[PDB]
Amino acid sequence: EYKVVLTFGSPMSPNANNKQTWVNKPLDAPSGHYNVKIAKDVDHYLTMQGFTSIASVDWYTIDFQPSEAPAPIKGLQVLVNISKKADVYAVKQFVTAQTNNKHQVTSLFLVKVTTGFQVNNYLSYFYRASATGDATTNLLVRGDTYTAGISFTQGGWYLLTNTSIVDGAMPPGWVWNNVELKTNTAYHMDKGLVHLIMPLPESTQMCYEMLTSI
Amino acid sequence: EYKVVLTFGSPMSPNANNKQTWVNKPLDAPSGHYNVKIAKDVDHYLTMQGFTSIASVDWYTIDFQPSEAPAPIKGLQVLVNISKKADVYAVKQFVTAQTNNKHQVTSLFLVKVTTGFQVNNYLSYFYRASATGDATTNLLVRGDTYTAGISFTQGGWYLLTNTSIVDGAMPPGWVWNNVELKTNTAYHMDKGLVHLIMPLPESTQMCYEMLTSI
């Protein structure tokens, strides 16, 4: 286990400092294109939603003493179609009980790209309508998608996310349920989503406690 | 200067895990009530907007070595009307250039309450409308306010925020411009706002580099 300090880079196109954060929404992609998947094997993988460039990474022990970067996690891969494009160095899940029967799971993967690539994906964003009075108004994902290209550069660090909503029974450890972003379903905030409302300014630092194994 | 790790408590009423974060919006308060102000003197103060309970604080040097908590910052006060309700232990501003002529300044104050108190304030929340296509849709503050009570407990740590939008010329160091949350004006995200969309789960940790002087 490590304490990991990420220094955020500039937003990845089509994102911008003054725009809503676009994330991949579905479990499919346009014709001729592919999702980015973070996979343990063919039956256990999560589809990339959030994509964020990380300028640098500082590694520490769990009590904050300085450490050299670990080696890649064996047996995890960032895949496009059937080819591995990045190594995974650290992982973390945030599990939130919205209710006992509705859990939100946000998975974060710190990855380093080994073959540069681009994908066209169906993108959307979080939004929240104004409402009158003290009524609850939900954090939602826009239904419509905007098809756009996303580019990943060799040698770059990236932070990838996936958020699932799991109904009913939960498994006991790492959750592999792969669920597209829902529209019409309330999300909560968790520490894995704080960078996905609008891009945080380049040079912003965030600290996470992360694992180097599933 | 310190690296400060905050462990978030439960949301403060009227907030909840499943609700938008309510923040104080204006520079005034209902009849018979008062804003919370974080003041250096009568001509230099910021009005509380965000209010968040912090369960615990861990203090480190700038390179992450463990440290005892500092003493309160002399000459800063958390005031209600004309009475000091809390000591300020650490401060930080995030300054964002939306454009060269529109800067966003988010100030964070880590405080410990010394006399418990309650205020009724005019509250609002951040929202973002759905829009079609790849149009930018702004992060805004709802115009309408909801009047509600906010309670602060003796001995508790709290994180207070203020965000200003400054038009034109900027001062060179700590910005004392006190500006209510605007409606109809785009906000960006900064590291001081990441906990103010919806409450982060109790026990979430966030790390900040903070000062113990202005």
Author numbering:
A (entry chain A), B (entry chain A): 431 to 644
Publication passage describing the model:
Human astroviruses (HAstVs) are nonenveloped, positive-sense, single-stranded RNA viruses that are a leading cause of viral gastroenteritis. HAstV particles display T=3 icosahedral symmetry formed by 180 copies of the capsid protein (CP), which undergoes proteolytic maturation to generate infectious HAstV particles. The AstV CP is composed of several domains, including a highly basic N-terminal domain, a core domain, a spike domain, and a C-terminal acidic domain. To further explore the structural features of the AstV CP, we determined the crystal structures of the HAstV-1 CP core and spike domains to 2.60-Å and 0.95-Å resolutions, respectively.
The HAstV-1 CP spike, composed of residues 429 to 645, was expressed in E. coli and purified. The HAstV-1 CP spike exhibited an apparent molecular mass of ∼50 kDa as examined by gel filtration chromatography, consistent with dimer formation. The purified HAstV-1 CP spike was crystallized in the space group P41212, and a native diffraction data set was collected to 0.95-Å resolution. The previously determined structure of the HAstV-8 CP spike was used as a molecular replacement model. Structural alignment of the HAstV-1 and HAstV-8 CP spike dimer structures by the DaliLite server revealed nearly identical structures, with an RMSD of 0.8 Å. One noteworthy difference was an unexpected disulfide bond formed at the interface between the two protomers of the HAstV-1 CP spike dimer, despite the presence of reducing agents throughout protein purification. Sequence alignments of the HAstV-1 to -8 capsid proteins revealed that this disulfide bond is unique to serotype HAstV-1. Consistent with previous studies with monoclonal antibodies, we found that the HAstV CP spike is antigenic. We mapped these sites in the context of our immature and mature HAstV models and found that the P site lies on the most outward side of the virus and is exposed in both immature and mature HAstV. In contrast, both the S site and the β-turn lie on the side of the spike and are sterically hindered by other spikes on immature HAstV.
